[PDB]
């Protein structure tokens, strides 16, 4: 719109989105809050040693990631990229043990202007700040021998937020220092230019130093504001917004020197100079929508003939979703935006590190909350071409000892042969359907049960005047004759038995419960007949099991029995204890007891 009709309304392009390509790379209060001083515990970037500067070889790609029970060891090892990025063939990770937990690791890289690339990688612990030289990796076996540019435990008993980079720059909560690293061996790192951005009314601990233009001028951040500091003169500026409606959420230098990517809350900010002197950009921006404190960002930078476009990954610690926007650098210092897109990932947890390195391919690594794995991902535009270890449930399914294997197998055999007994047993009962034998059985069954039911009704007459409760004892049953249930095997004549039993005990003060309206809960549609119940279940299972007729009959029998009513003497007996308990209660709770409201 802006340029299309400044020149003289849809977009510039059609509608294209996200796809994946996955791979494994390497393996290694608090419930409601998090420490901002722990940014990222793994980096991977192009490094270049001295022996790489004798030739024209462009160094190598390395990863450095933290490890340990207490996360207090550094691991540095080389990568080789072929079909997809992968760890070196000889897998000789070079790990060095510290005694302090690692809070932040970053390998600095260098500008294109210097010709060289970084020779070092630096770390902030809970106790110290150290810089490591990588000196002379060699292909004899893919070794990465490193040296320990010496720690400085503390000068101020202060934790340090961010390190930026030859210039070791530190930020501790409010106050910063520019410093330098020793050359190779064995004098350690010193400083002489210092400052502070302290702000009593910002409680969150994270601040951040990353400089700008390579002009030898720095940026210092807290969740309240963004301060530029031209630090080889004397210069300081609070750039134009402050702390009114949003917090600075992250900032990372979009890799090209004069380029700045800042997550606020609900805004992706592309700062970057369009003047040799440092800048702000209010070249308009996009916005992204939460209250989440835990948002971070990274950019990948892809090159093309007519533009130079940047992909912005904003990720969280709450949900494994990644939120992506795309910008473009047509170097008239032209910036435009196109439309949003978001992807998910997998079960419980969330990103602790996202790190980047007519279609778009953008590739990176992720590390998830509380999972030592490091996964390489790749993303493409179109399509022209769970492995469960939930240790909570496997610990519940795989139980250890061998007698706890053959124990389970023993029980399984017990029930399996029992099931054979069920099949062979009921079979002949199915052979007799509509027989005169099953008729005899439904007769002497129905009214045998009628005799027992009457007996239990007499022994309900003797205890009738209880009036303390209103639920008769062990009521609803076949009433202590159990063999009489099973032996039949014809659902409709059995439903007719029950209908004529309910009919028979219509002599009042007896329970009434209509089954159909309750099978409603079983099949989730009106089940008028006790038979149609059997029909529907039999369709379903006749698709799936042999003797589905026998089981379905045995289970509609089992259900119809499990629900076979015979509760306390009916409605006229409950009102007795109803009123009599509504008596022993004090008089005005008795006045509050209220039927038929409105």
């Amino acid at each position: 719109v802006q340029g299309a009709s400044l020149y003289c309304t849809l977009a510039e392009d059609a509608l294209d989105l996200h796809i994946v390509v996955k791979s494994l790379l390497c393996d290694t209060q608090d419930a409601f809050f998090w420490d901002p001083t722990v940014a990222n515990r793994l980096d991977s970037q192009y490094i270049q040693t001295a022996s790489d500067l004798r030739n024209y070889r462009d160094g190598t790609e390395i990863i450095a990631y933290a490890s340990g029970k207490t996360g207090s060891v550094l691991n540095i090892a080389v990568l080789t990229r072929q079909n997809t990025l992968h760890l070196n063939r000889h897998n000789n990770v070079t790990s060095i043990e510290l005694h302090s937990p690692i809070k932040s690791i970053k390998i600095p890289g260098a500008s294109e202007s210097i010709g060289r690339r970084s020779n070092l990688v630096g770390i902030i612990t809970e106790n110290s700040f150290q810089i490591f030289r990588i000196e002379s990796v060699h292909s004899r076996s893919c070794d990465v021998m490193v040296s320990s540019s010496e720690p400085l435990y503390f000068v101020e008993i202060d934790d340090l937020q961010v390190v930026d980079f030859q210039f070791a720059i530190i930020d501790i909560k409010g106050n910063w220092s520019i410093g330098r690293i020793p050359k190779n061996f064995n004098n350690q790192l010193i400083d002489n230019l210092h400052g502070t951005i302290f702000d009593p009314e910002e409680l969150s601990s994270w601040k951040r130093i990353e400089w700008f233009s390579h002009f030898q001028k720095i940026l210092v951040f807290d969740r309240s504001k963004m301060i530029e500091i031209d630090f080889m003169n004397n210069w300081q500026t609070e750039v134009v917004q402050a702390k009114a409606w949003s917090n600075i959420r992250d900032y990372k230098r979009i890799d090209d020197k004069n380029g700045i990517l800042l997550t606020s809350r609900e805004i992706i900010i592309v700062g970057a100079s369009e003047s040799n002197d440092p800048v702000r950009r209010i070249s308009w921006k996009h916005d992204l929508d939460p209250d989440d404190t835990t948002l971070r960002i990274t950019v990948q930078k892809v090159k093309k003939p007519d533009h130079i476009l940047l992909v912005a990954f904003v990720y969280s610690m709450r949900h494994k979703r990644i939120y992506m926007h795309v910008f473009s650098h047509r170097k008239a210092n032209l910036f435009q935006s196109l439309g949003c897109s978001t992807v998910l990932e997998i079960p419980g947890g969330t990103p602790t590190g996202i790190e980047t390195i007519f279609e778009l391919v953008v590739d990176f690594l992720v590390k998830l909350r509380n999972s030592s794995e490091v996964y390489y991902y790749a993303l493409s535009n179109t399509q022209n071409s769970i492995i469960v270890d939930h240790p909570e449930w496997a610990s519940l399914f795989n139980n250890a000892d061998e007698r706890e294997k053959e124990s389970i197998g023993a029980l399984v055999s017990q029930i399996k042969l029992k099931e054979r007994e069920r099949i062979s047993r009921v079979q002949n009962l199915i052979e007799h359907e509509n027989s005169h034998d099953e008729d005899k059985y439904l007769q002497d069954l129905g009214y045998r049960l009628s005799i027992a039911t009457n007996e239990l009704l007499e022994s309900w007459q003797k205890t009738k005047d209880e009036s303390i409760l209103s639920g008769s004892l062990s009521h609803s049953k076949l009433k202590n004759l159990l063999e009489n249930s099973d032996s039949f095997a014809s659902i409709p004549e059995f439903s007719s038995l029950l209908d004529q039993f309910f009919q028979y005990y219509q002599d009042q003060d007896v329970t009434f419960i209509g089954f159909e309206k309750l099978l409603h809960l079983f099949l989730h549609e009106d089940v008028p007949g006790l038979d149609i119940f059997y029909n529907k279940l039999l369709q379903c299972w006749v698709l799936v099991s042999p003797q589905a007729e026998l089981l379905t009959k045995e289970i509609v029998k089992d259900i119809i029995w499990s629900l076979a009513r015979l509760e306390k003497p009916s409605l006229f007996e409950p009102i007795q204890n109803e009123i009599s308990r509504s008596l022993s209660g004090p008089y005005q709770d008795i006045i509050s007891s209220w039927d038929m409201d409105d």
């Binding site: 009709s5 309304t9 101020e156 400052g195 929508d289 610690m317 897109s341």
Partner: protein, 303 residues
């Protein structure tokens, strides 16, 4: 996982705001000493500044030089030691979850539960899922579904309209039926440009000083509804109508209407016209390309 268009559940977040700004008061007070209530939160949040047409910012020059270390461990804990007990008093009145909250923000930790993520009431959690599905579908080009989401959402009694860009790009890419994004935008401007705090950032605003988003977007988008043409003297008729003189961007909208109408002495008057509104658009925070894209077009016109 998206912003909700409802006022936030009230009880606990407000008393946390209390504890926060009250402790902030005590620490910053004693800090200025060493350098020598909703209303407490109110004063506290108070004393503080509250080649293409880039509404440029204010860059770096005329700003004061430096500061060198103010805060060692001992000195900070000097400033911190006392205001924390003062906090020990009303911490005893607030709830335990907000005790632990205050202790953690005052340790410097940050909460990883959002205000949304802990509202946990039926209706609001449902609205959260609804709004989410709106934002998702709008990302997914599913303008049909997204439209159903939007209508069902605005139906609900709690949602006031941040969602206007949602519907702007929504009906824009919809093309389907309903009175389109221009209709909606000029509606937003007609209803919310007259008198006729908590909830209000800048993408919905009051007509004292700049009502931003919707106005400039119906302005430009209407000039693009002239890109449909080659209506203009209409758009600059009702850009001529309002006095809101600081509105420089509407001065560049004005001069753009005159350049688009300039594409005989009438065309002359239109070219002198745009020549004028460009400088009365140098009145305010500049939208500039140069003088040559401004004029060189007008000399290709002077042909």
């Amino acid at each position: 996982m998206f912003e909700v268009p409802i006022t936030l559940t009230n009880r606990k977040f407000a008393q946390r705001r209390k504890l926060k700004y009250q402790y902030i008061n005590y620490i910053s007070r004693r800090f200025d000493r060493i350098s020598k209530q909703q209303k407490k939160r109110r004063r506290e949040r108070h004393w503080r500044s509250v080649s293409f047409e880039i509404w440029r910012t204010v860059s770096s020059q005329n700003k004061q030089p430096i500061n060198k270390q103010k805060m060692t461990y001992h000195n900070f804990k000097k400033i911190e030691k006392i205001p924390l007990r003062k906090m020990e008093i009303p911490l005893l009145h607030c709830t335990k979850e907000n005790k632990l909250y205050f202790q953690s923000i005052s340790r410097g930790l940050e909460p990883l539960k959002t205000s949304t993520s802990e509202v946990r009431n039926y209706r609001t959690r449902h609205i959260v899922t609804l709004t989410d599905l709106l934002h998702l579908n709008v990302s997914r080009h599913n303008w049909s579904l997204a439209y159903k989401i939007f209508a069902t959402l605005i139906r609900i009694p709690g949602v006031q309209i941040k969602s206007l860009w949602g519907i702007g790009v929504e009906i824009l890419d919809n093309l389907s039926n309903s009175s389109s994004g221009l209709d909606f935008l000029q509606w937003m401007c007609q209803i919310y440009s007259s008198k006729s705090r908590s909830i209000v950032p800048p993408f919905q605003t009051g007509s004292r000083t700049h009502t931003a988003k919707f106005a400039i977007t119906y302005l430009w988008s209407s000039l693009i509804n002239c890109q449909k043409s080659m209506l203009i003297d209409k758009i600059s008729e009702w850009v001529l109508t309002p006095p809101f003189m600081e509105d420089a961007e509407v001065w560049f909208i004005y001069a753009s209407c005159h350049l688009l109408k300039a594409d005989i002495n009438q065309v002359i008057k239109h070219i002198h016209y745009v020549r004028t509104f460009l400088k009365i658009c140098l009145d305010k925070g500049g939208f500039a390309v140069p003088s040559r894209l401004i004029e060189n077009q007008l000399k290709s016109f002077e042909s």
